[PDB]
């Protein structure tokens, strides 16, 4: 149940979301990644930013050692954080991710965001007035250093995340481009379906990968508590009854039938196991059109300095 990527590698269409907020103890990530593998998830999504690659990597090593899976059955993604965009910082950031996860390679490596930040080991560097310190970096150079990580076998595939059309084109039109991005991982759900962006990506053999596909985790630090609750949508609930499924399952299947690869985060055993049931049913053409008409251009993630920057993808 995979899609063939533009560099010849295979990406499982359903992936496990590993982020949890810092109030959740780091042992949980270990434990739920193991349950997700047990349930049948083979694609696993992490990042430097998430402070969990050690635990996610140890979960994977555990499922290999107990003979449930081999390394080559597992599709593991990490991301290059925006403090490491300068070309010389790229390979060491990747080697550092690999060392924490105790893996020899990632299956996929992404530029987490086009928005560059001040080099350092602060995740969020700020000045004396508490303002986020942005950096200016030619992203084409950052890309060339990603290409080099693929040539070196440290990343089987390389792609981007949180890019708009203009930013993709900048990579695609780069002189001497060796490797296209395999994918563009972006916020994508029935209230923000990204249809234009999706058609652009289909036209270049770039896979759109959907995050917050179930309506985000609604963390009060960066999601407006007044935003509508995706899984409480009436059209989705009505479709969950029709098919005898749940609204989350309607949300996930939507993305599969439109050719989006879809991530799903759950730290709850029963919801982890429920989510692999996306493969057990179909939506009709009409069902698909009913979900299409839910778009509200609603992004869950919002920051005081994100909606500000010269590389802000929504501007
Ligand atoms: N590239 C980027 O910038 C970026 C940004 C955001 C996210 N991501 C990635 O995308 C992943 C997923 O996105 P997300 O973290 O925003 O969460 P999500 O996949 O939209 O899920 C949101 C919530 O839905 C709940 N849930 C899951 N399955 C369910 C079901 N079957 N029924 C009812 N509720 C269900 C989960 O809560 P429970 O834990 O209570 O089950 C979860 O907190 C992340 O973990 C991360 O790996 C990447
Ligand atoms: C505005 C961007 C930014 C800084 C500047 C510093 N800083 C940061 O220190 N983080 C705090 C921890 C956190 C926040 C959200 C999530 S998240 O929303 O679950 N996961 C994601 O991967 N991506 C989010 C982060 C990247 C942006 C572009 C898209 C959404 C995971 C972890 C940021 O976030």
Q: For ligand 1, what atom is nearest to the CA of residue 247?
A: 32
Q: How many domains does the chain have?
A: 1
Determine which residue's CA is closest to atom 17 belonging to ligand 2. 19
Quick check: is 300 catalytic?
A: no
Q: Are strands 2-4 and 10-12 parallel, antiparallel or unpaired?
A: antiparallel
Task: Name the residue range of residue 20's domain.
Answer: 1-315
- Resolution to 1 decimal, in Å? 2.3
Q: For ligand 2, what atom is nearest to the CA of residue 124?
A: 6
3-state secondary structure the chain: CEEECCCCCEEECEEEECCCCCCCCCHHHHHHHHHHHHHCCCEEECCHHHCCHHHHHHHHHHHHHCCCCCHHHCEEEEEECHHHCCHHHHHHHHHHHHHHHCCCCEEEEEECCCCCECCCCCCCCECCCCCECECCCCHHHHHHHHHHHHHCCCEEEEEEECCCHHHHHHHHCCCCCCCCCCEEEEECECCECCHHHHHHHHCCCCEEEEECCCCCCCCCCCCCCCCCCHHHCHHHHHHHHHCCCCHHHHHHHHHHHCCCEEEEECCCHHHHHHHHHHHHCCCCHHHHHHHHCCCCCCCCCCCCCCCCCCCCCCC
Method for structure elucidation:
X-ray
CATH code (residue 99): 3.20.20.100
Binding-site residues for NADP(+) sit at 18-19, 45, 161-162, 185, 211-217, 265-267, 271-275
Ligand nearest to the CA of 212: 1
Q: Candidates 301, 307, 308: which one to mutate for ligand 2, based on the most atoms within 8 Å of Cβ?
A: 301
Determine which residue's CA is closest to atom 28 belonging to ligand 2. 113
């Amino acid at each position: 149940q995979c899609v063939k990527l533009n560099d010849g590698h295979f990406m499982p269409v359903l992936g496990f979301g590993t982020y949890a907020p810092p109030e959740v103890p780091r042992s949980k990530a270990l434990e739920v990644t193991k349950l997700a593998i047990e349930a049948g998830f083979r694609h696993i999504d992490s990042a430097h930013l998430y402070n969990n690659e050690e635990q996610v990597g140890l979960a994977i090593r555990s499922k290999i050692a107990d003979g449930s899976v081999k390394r080559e059955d597992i599709f593991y993604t990490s991301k290059l954080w925006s403090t490491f965009h300068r070309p010389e910082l790229v390979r060491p950031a990747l080697e550092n991710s690999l060392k924490k996860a105790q893996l020899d390679y990632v299956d996929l490596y992404l530029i987490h965001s086009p928005m560059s930040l001040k080099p350092g080991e602060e995740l969020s560097p700020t000045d004396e007035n508490g303002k986020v310190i942005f950096d200016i970096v030619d992203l084409c150079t950052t890309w060339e250093a990603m290409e080099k990580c693929k040539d070196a076998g440290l990343a089987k595939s390389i792609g981007v995340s949180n890019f708009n059309r203009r930013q993709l084109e900048m990579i695609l039109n780069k002189p001497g481009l060796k490797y296209k991005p395999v994918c563009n991982q972006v916020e994508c759900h029935p209230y923000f379906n990204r249809s234009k962006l999706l058609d652009f990506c289909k036209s270049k053999d770039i896979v759109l990968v959907a995050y917050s596909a179930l309506g985000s985790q609604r963390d009060k630090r960066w999601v407006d508590p007044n935003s509508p609750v995706l899984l409480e949508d009436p059209v989705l609930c009505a479709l969950a009854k029709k098919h005898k499924r749940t609204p989350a399952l309607i949300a996930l299947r939507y993305q599969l039938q439109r050719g989006v690869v879809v991530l799903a985060k759950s730290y709850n055993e029963q919801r982890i196991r429920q989510n692999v049931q996306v493969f057990e049913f179909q939506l009709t053409a009409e069902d698909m059109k009913a979900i299409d008409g839910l778009d509200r251009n609603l992004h869950y993630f919002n920051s005081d300095s994100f909606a500000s920057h010269p590389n802000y993808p929504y501007s």
